[PDB]
PDB file of C-alpha atoms and ligand atoms in Angstrom:
ATOM      1  CA  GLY A   1     -16.726  -5.459   7.207  1.00  0.00           C
ATOM      2  CA  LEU A   2     -15.487  -8.651   5.553  1.00  0.00           C
ATOM      3  CA  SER A   3     -16.967 -12.097   6.074  1.00  0.00           C
ATOM      4  CA  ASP A   4     -14.846 -14.936   7.501  1.00  0.00           C
ATOM      5  CA  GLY A   5     -14.720 -16.387   3.970  1.00  0.00           C
ATOM      6  CA  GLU A   6     -13.502 -13.079   2.569  1.00  0.00           C
ATOM      7  CA  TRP A   7     -10.783 -12.729   5.215  1.00  0.00           C
ATOM      8  CA  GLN A   8      -9.626 -16.256   4.409  1.00  0.00           C
ATOM      9  CA  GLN A   9      -9.331 -15.275   0.750  1.00  0.00           C
ATOM     10  CA  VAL A  10      -7.441 -12.079   1.637  1.00  0.00           C
ATOM     11  CA  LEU A  11      -4.917 -14.009   3.735  1.00  0.00           C
ATOM     12  CA  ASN A  12      -4.590 -16.747   1.102  1.00  0.00           C
ATOM     13  CA  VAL A  13      -3.784 -14.112  -1.530  1.00  0.00           C
ATOM     14  CA  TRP A  14      -1.315 -12.541   0.912  1.00  0.00           C
ATOM     15  CA  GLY A  15       0.608 -15.851   0.914  1.00  0.00           C
ATOM     16  CA  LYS A  16       1.666 -14.852  -2.629  1.00  0.00           C
ATOM     17  CA  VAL A  17       3.066 -11.545  -1.360  1.00  0.00           C
ATOM     18  CA  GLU A  18       4.917 -13.213   1.532  1.00  0.00           C
ATOM     19  CA  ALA A  19       6.864 -15.539  -0.795  1.00  0.00           C
ATOM     20  CA  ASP A  20       8.508 -12.442  -2.320  1.00  0.00           C
ATOM     21  CA  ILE A  21       7.776  -9.422  -0.162  1.00  0.00           C
ATOM     22  CA  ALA A  22      10.568  -7.231  -1.605  1.00  0.00           C
ATOM     23  CA  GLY A  23       9.665  -8.030  -5.250  1.00  0.00           C
ATOM     24  CA  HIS A  24       5.995  -7.328  -4.675  1.00  0.00           C
ATOM     25  CA  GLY A  25       6.846  -4.190  -2.654  1.00  0.00           C
ATOM     26  CA  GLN A  26       9.173  -2.867  -5.351  1.00  0.00           C
ATOM     27  CA  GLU A  27       6.613  -3.480  -8.142  1.00  0.00           C
ATOM     28  CA  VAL A  28       3.837  -1.823  -6.117  1.00  0.00           C
ATOM     29  CA  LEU A  29       5.919   1.337  -5.550  1.00  0.00           C
ATOM     30  CA  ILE A  30       7.111   1.390  -9.178  1.00  0.00           C
ATOM     31  CA  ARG A  31       3.486   1.106 -10.385  1.00  0.00           C
ATOM     32  CA  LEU A  32       2.537   3.944  -8.000  1.00  0.00           C
ATOM     33  CA  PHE A  33       5.417   6.225  -9.020  1.00  0.00           C
ATOM     34  CA  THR A  34       5.168   5.639 -12.777  1.00  0.00           C
ATOM     35  CA  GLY A  35       1.364   5.987 -12.917  1.00  0.00           C
ATOM     36  CA  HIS A  36       1.309   8.964 -10.553  1.00  0.00           C
ATOM     37  CA  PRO A  37       4.619  10.926 -10.583  1.00  0.00           C
ATOM     38  CA  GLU A  38       3.315  13.417  -8.012  1.00  0.00           C
ATOM     39  CA  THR A  39       3.577  10.632  -5.433  1.00  0.00           C
ATOM     40  CA  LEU A  40       7.341  10.349  -5.984  1.00  0.00           C
ATOM     41  CA  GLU A  41       7.621  14.008  -4.886  1.00  0.00           C
ATOM     42  CA  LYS A  42       6.414  13.058  -1.397  1.00  0.00           C
ATOM     43  CA  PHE A  43       9.581  10.969  -0.941  1.00  0.00           C
ATOM     44  CA  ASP A  44      12.714  13.111  -0.691  1.00  0.00           C
ATOM     45  CA  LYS A  45      14.693   9.847  -0.756  1.00  0.00           C
ATOM     46  CA  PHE A  46      13.171   8.779  -4.107  1.00  0.00           C
ATOM     47  CA  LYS A  47      12.701  12.001  -6.054  1.00  0.00           C
ATOM     48  CA  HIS A  48      16.193  11.499  -7.566  1.00  0.00           C
ATOM     49  CA  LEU A  49      14.702   8.506  -9.420  1.00  0.00           C
ATOM     50  CA  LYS A  50      14.186   9.980 -12.868  1.00  0.00           C
ATOM     51  CA  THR A  51      13.555   6.721 -14.764  1.00  0.00           C
ATOM     52  CA  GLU A  52      11.943   3.337 -14.122  1.00  0.00           C
ATOM     53  CA  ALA A  53      15.351   1.697 -14.698  1.00  0.00           C
ATOM     54  CA  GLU A  54      16.723   3.755 -11.808  1.00  0.00           C
ATOM     55  CA  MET A  55      13.676   2.743  -9.709  1.00  0.00           C
ATOM     56  CA  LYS A  56      14.198  -0.933 -10.582  1.00  0.00           C
ATOM     57  CA  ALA A  57      17.907  -0.676  -9.701  1.00  0.00           C
ATOM     58  CA  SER A  58      17.273   1.132  -6.407  1.00  0.00           C
ATOM     59  CA  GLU A  59      17.921  -1.210  -3.486  1.00  0.00           C
ATOM     60  CA  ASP A  60      16.509   1.390  -1.081  1.00  0.00           C
ATOM     61  CA  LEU A  61      13.206   1.408  -3.017  1.00  0.00           C
ATOM     62  CA  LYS A  62      13.027  -2.382  -2.611  1.00  0.00           C
ATOM     63  CA  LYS A  63      13.817  -1.899   1.077  1.00  0.00           C
ATOM     64  CA  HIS A  64      10.967   0.600   1.470  1.00  0.00           C
ATOM     65  CA  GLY A  65       8.680  -1.771  -0.477  1.00  0.00           C
ATOM     66  CA  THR A  66       9.428  -4.417   2.158  1.00  0.00           C
ATOM     67  CA  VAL A  67       8.636  -1.937   4.988  1.00  0.00           C
ATOM     68  CA  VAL A  68       5.335  -0.955   3.360  1.00  0.00           C
ATOM     69  CA  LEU A  69       3.981  -4.427   2.605  1.00  0.00           C
ATOM     70  CA  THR A  70       5.174  -5.757   5.992  1.00  0.00           C
ATOM     71  CA  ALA A  71       3.150  -3.000   7.687  1.00  0.00           C
ATOM     72  CA  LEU A  72       0.113  -3.723   5.465  1.00  0.00           C
ATOM     73  CA  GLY A  73       0.427  -7.480   6.048  1.00  0.00           C
ATOM     74  CA  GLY A  74       0.395  -7.016   9.831  1.00  0.00           C
ATOM     75  CA  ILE A  75      -2.742  -4.901   9.455  1.00  0.00           C
ATOM     76  CA  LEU A  76      -4.486  -7.459   7.218  1.00  0.00           C
ATOM     77  CA  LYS A  77      -3.731 -10.301   9.646  1.00  0.00           C
ATOM     78  CA  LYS A  78      -5.784  -8.410  12.266  1.00  0.00           C
ATOM     79  CA  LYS A  79      -8.862  -8.974  10.074  1.00  0.00           C
ATOM     80  CA  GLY A  80     -10.232  -5.478  10.727  1.00  0.00           C
ATOM     81  CA  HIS A  81      -9.246  -5.367  14.425  1.00  0.00           C
ATOM     82  CA  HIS A  82      -6.438  -2.990  13.497  1.00  0.00           C
ATOM     83  CA  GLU A  83      -6.984   0.260  15.435  1.00  0.00           C
ATOM     84  CA  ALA A  84      -3.587   0.094  17.236  1.00  0.00           C
ATOM     85  CA  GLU A  85      -1.750  -0.717  13.984  1.00  0.00           C
ATOM     86  CA  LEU A  86      -3.612   1.724  11.755  1.00  0.00           C
ATOM     87  CA  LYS A  87      -3.800   4.814  14.020  1.00  0.00           C
ATOM     88  CA  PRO A  88       0.002   5.588  13.994  1.00  0.00           C
ATOM     89  CA  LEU A  89       0.207   5.094  10.215  1.00  0.00           C
ATOM     90  CA  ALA A  90      -2.756   7.385   9.625  1.00  0.00           C
ATOM     91  CA  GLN A  91      -1.118   9.996  11.849  1.00  0.00           C
ATOM     92  CA  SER A  92       2.375   9.804  10.325  1.00  0.00           C
ATOM     93  CA  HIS A  93       0.985   9.878   6.791  1.00  0.00           C
ATOM     94  CA  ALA A  94      -1.298  12.866   7.431  1.00  0.00           C
ATOM     95  CA  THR A  95       0.864  14.951   9.756  1.00  0.00           C
ATOM     96  CA  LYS A  96       4.439  14.118   8.834  1.00  0.00           C
ATOM     97  CA  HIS A  97       4.397  12.836   5.252  1.00  0.00           C
ATOM     98  CA  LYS A  98       1.378  14.873   4.051  1.00  0.00           C
ATOM     99  CA  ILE A  99      -0.065  12.081   1.912  1.00  0.00           C
ATOM    100  CA  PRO A 100      -3.553  12.857   0.560  1.00  0.00           C
ATOM    101  CA  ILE A 101      -6.043   9.978   0.865  1.00  0.00           C
ATOM    102  CA  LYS A 102      -6.180   9.877  -2.976  1.00  0.00           C
ATOM    103  CA  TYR A 103      -2.604   8.532  -2.937  1.00  0.00           C
ATOM    104  CA  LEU A 104      -3.773   5.639  -0.713  1.00  0.00           C
ATOM    105  CA  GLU A 105      -6.393   4.959  -3.380  1.00  0.00           C
ATOM    106  CA  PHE A 106      -3.574   4.938  -5.960  1.00  0.00           C
ATOM    107  CA  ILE A 107      -1.457   2.464  -3.975  1.00  0.00           C
ATOM    108  CA  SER A 108      -4.519   0.209  -3.334  1.00  0.00           C
ATOM    109  CA  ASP A 109      -5.112   0.081  -7.106  1.00  0.00           C
ATOM    110  CA  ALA A 110      -1.359  -0.578  -7.638  1.00  0.00           C
ATOM    111  CA  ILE A 111      -1.563  -3.641  -5.318  1.00  0.00           C
ATOM    112  CA  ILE A 112      -4.462  -5.122  -7.338  1.00  0.00           C
ATOM    113  CA  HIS A 113      -2.571  -4.467 -10.596  1.00  0.00           C
ATOM    114  CA  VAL A 114       0.683  -6.022  -9.326  1.00  0.00           C
ATOM    115  CA  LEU A 115      -1.139  -9.141  -8.045  1.00  0.00           C
ATOM    116  CA  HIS A 116      -2.615  -9.715 -11.505  1.00  0.00           C
ATOM    117  CA  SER A 117       0.706  -8.898 -13.188  1.00  0.00           C
ATOM    118  CA  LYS A 118       2.740 -11.326 -11.067  1.00  0.00           C
ATOM    119  CA  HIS A 119       0.065 -14.050 -10.867  1.00  0.00           C
ATOM    120  CA  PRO A 120      -1.937 -13.845 -14.126  1.00  0.00           C
ATOM    121  CA  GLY A 121      -4.825 -16.333 -14.039  1.00  0.00           C
ATOM    122  CA  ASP A 122      -4.088 -17.087 -10.387  1.00  0.00           C
ATOM    123  CA  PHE A 123      -5.868 -14.095  -8.788  1.00  0.00           C
ATOM    124  CA  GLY A 124      -9.507 -15.110  -9.154  1.00  0.00           C
ATOM    125  CA  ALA A 125     -12.633 -12.962  -9.179  1.00  0.00           C
ATOM    126  CA  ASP A 126     -13.508 -13.972  -5.574  1.00  0.00           C
ATOM    127  CA  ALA A 127      -9.915 -13.194  -4.484  1.00  0.00           C
ATOM    128  CA  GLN A 128      -9.949  -9.780  -6.162  1.00  0.00           C
ATOM    129  CA  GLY A 129     -13.307  -9.027  -4.468  1.00  0.00           C
ATOM    130  CA  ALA A 130     -11.975  -9.949  -1.019  1.00  0.00           C
ATOM    131  CA  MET A 131      -8.629  -8.126  -1.365  1.00  0.00           C
ATOM    132  CA  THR A 132     -10.391  -5.025  -2.737  1.00  0.00           C
ATOM    133  CA  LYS A 133     -12.748  -5.055   0.303  1.00  0.00           C
ATOM    134  CA  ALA A 134      -9.762  -5.340   2.686  1.00  0.00           C
ATOM    135  CA  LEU A 135      -7.959  -2.453   0.963  1.00  0.00           C
ATOM    136  CA  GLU A 136     -11.103  -0.334   1.075  1.00  0.00           C
ATOM    137  CA  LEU A 137     -11.543  -1.047   4.792  1.00  0.00           C
ATOM    138  CA  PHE A 138      -7.913  -0.016   5.360  1.00  0.00           C
ATOM    139  CA  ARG A 139      -8.427   3.174   3.304  1.00  0.00           C
ATOM    140  CA  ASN A 140     -11.738   3.979   4.955  1.00  0.00           C
ATOM    141  CA  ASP A 141     -10.379   3.596   8.503  1.00  0.00           C
ATOM    142  CA  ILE A 142      -7.355   5.809   7.601  1.00  0.00           C
ATOM    143  CA  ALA A 143      -9.821   8.354   6.132  1.00  0.00           C
ATOM    144  CA  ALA A 144     -11.667   8.500   9.475  1.00  0.00           C
ATOM    145  CA  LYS A 145      -8.348   9.413  11.171  1.00  0.00           C
ATOM    146  CA  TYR A 146      -7.580  11.967   8.432  1.00  0.00           C
ATOM    147  CA  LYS A 147     -10.963  13.615   9.048  1.00  0.00           C
ATOM    148  CA  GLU A 148     -10.248  13.768  12.794  1.00  0.00           C
ATOM    149  CA  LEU A 149      -7.009  15.622  11.941  1.00  0.00           C
ATOM    150  CA  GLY A 150      -8.696  17.839   9.327  1.00  0.00           C
ATOM    151  CA  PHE A 151      -6.134  16.672   6.807  1.00  0.00           C
ATOM    152  CA  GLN A 152      -7.232  17.528   3.225  1.00  0.00           C
TER     153      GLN A 152
HETATM  154  C1  HEM B   1      -0.397   0.517   1.922  1.00  0.00           C
HETATM  155  C2  HEM B   1      -0.324   1.810   2.274  1.00  0.00           C
HETATM  156  C3  HEM B   1       0.939   2.336   2.982  1.00  0.00           C
HETATM  157  C4  HEM B   1       1.590   1.749   3.998  1.00  0.00           C
HETATM  158  C5  HEM B   1       1.205   0.423   4.695  1.00  0.00           C
HETATM  159  C6  HEM B   1       2.719   2.588   4.361  1.00  0.00           C
HETATM  160  C7  HEM B   1       3.626   2.291   5.355  1.00  0.00           C
HETATM  161  C8  HEM B   1       4.695   3.076   5.745  1.00  0.00           C
HETATM  162  C9  HEM B   1       5.613   2.819   6.840  1.00  0.00           C
HETATM  163  C10 HEM B   1       5.532   1.589   7.775  1.00  0.00           C
HETATM  164  C11 HEM B   1       6.486   3.837   6.875  1.00  0.00           C
HETATM  165  C12 HEM B   1       7.636   4.049   7.878  1.00  0.00           C
HETATM  166  C13 HEM B   1       7.029   4.477   9.233  1.00  0.00           C
HETATM  167  C14 HEM B   1       6.221   5.762   9.180  1.00  0.00           C
HETATM  168  O1  HEM B   1       6.803   6.828   8.794  1.00  0.00           O
HETATM  169  O2  HEM B   1       4.999   5.710   9.538  1.00  0.00           O
HETATM  170  C15 HEM B   1       6.150   4.769   5.807  1.00  0.00           C
HETATM  171  C16 HEM B   1       6.812   5.928   5.495  1.00  0.00           C
HETATM  172  C17 HEM B   1       6.503   6.804   4.467  1.00  0.00           C
HETATM  173  N1  HEM B   1       5.417   6.747   3.590  1.00  0.00           N
HETATM  174 FE1  HEM B   1       4.069   5.249   3.604  1.00  0.00          FE
HETATM  175  N2  HEM B   1       2.714   3.693   3.517  1.00  0.00           N
HETATM  176  C18 HEM B   1       1.641   3.570   2.657  1.00  0.00           C
HETATM  177  C19 HEM B   1       1.303   4.464   1.661  1.00  0.00           C
HETATM  178  C20 HEM B   1       2.012   5.591   1.289  1.00  0.00           C
HETATM  179  C21 HEM B   1       1.750   6.402   0.115  1.00  0.00           C
HETATM  180  C22 HEM B   1       0.631   6.113  -0.911  1.00  0.00           C
HETATM  181  C23 HEM B   1       2.650   7.401   0.073  1.00  0.00           C
HETATM  182  C24 HEM B   1       2.704   8.494  -1.040  1.00  0.00           C
HETATM  183  C25 HEM B   1       3.803   9.177  -1.306  1.00  0.00           C
HETATM  184  C26 HEM B   1       3.504   7.252   1.262  1.00  0.00           C
HETATM  185  C27 HEM B   1       4.548   8.054   1.661  1.00  0.00           C
HETATM  186  C28 HEM B   1       5.441   7.807   2.679  1.00  0.00           C
HETATM  187  C29 HEM B   1       6.596   8.639   2.965  1.00  0.00           C
HETATM  188  C30 HEM B   1       7.029   9.931   2.249  1.00  0.00           C
HETATM  189  C31 HEM B   1       7.286   7.978   4.148  1.00  0.00           C
HETATM  190  C32 HEM B   1       8.573   8.429   4.842  1.00  0.00           C
HETATM  191  C33 HEM B   1       9.728   7.832   4.051  1.00  0.00           C
HETATM  192  C34 HEM B   1      11.051   8.281   4.630  1.00  0.00           C
HETATM  193  O3  HEM B   1      11.124   9.196   5.503  1.00  0.00           O
HETATM  194  O4  HEM B   1      12.064   7.702   4.219  1.00  0.00           O
HETATM  195  N3  HEM B   1       3.089   6.132   1.951  1.00  0.00           N
HETATM  196  N4  HEM B   1       5.057   4.264   5.142  1.00  0.00           N
HETATM  197  O1  NO2 B   2       5.405   3.570   0.307  1.00  0.00           O
HETATM  198  N1  NO2 B   2       4.685   3.996   1.217  1.00  0.00           N
HETATM  199  O2  NO2 B   2       5.233   4.157   2.317  1.00  0.00           O
END
């Protein structure tokens, strides 16, 4: 788990995301899709996006970015007490969307990259430690649900 201090850092960092949820969301998905094109194939509604320019110009991608980070933000604000929030996401992502846990690793890494990219010099070593711990906890709890379902 995370310490109280670590949770406070996580939620302080998240303040940055909340000032521009769509912009952060868009950049996270673009980072995911460009670094790992196989992930784009999981989205029927985005696999028409051939180029990063098309991704950047896609208002629906920005919209989905907002949905994703809003969901994650709600989870983070539970400070690990997130069973009710996490269970349905784990189940939809395993059973409906067929998203291997590796792709959740990819998007976790994308979040860290985007935070540094948008806030260079303002995402300190302690902050990166705390956010990484929160993202791992999220991933690990999803993985438990994936194992239950025998997914991958
Ligand atoms: C931070 C981690 C993630 C969060 C919080 C998240 C959140 C969400 C939410 C709230 C939805 C809509 C409700 C639902 O279907 O459950 C959704 C849909 C979806 N997610 Fe995720 N997601 C994450 C990671 C991923 C990753 C890495 C992929 C890889 C491709 C993915 C693929 C999809 C797909 C294909 C849909 C359905 C889109 C549609 O039908 O239009 N998700 N996600
Ligand atoms: O973008 N993940 O839903």
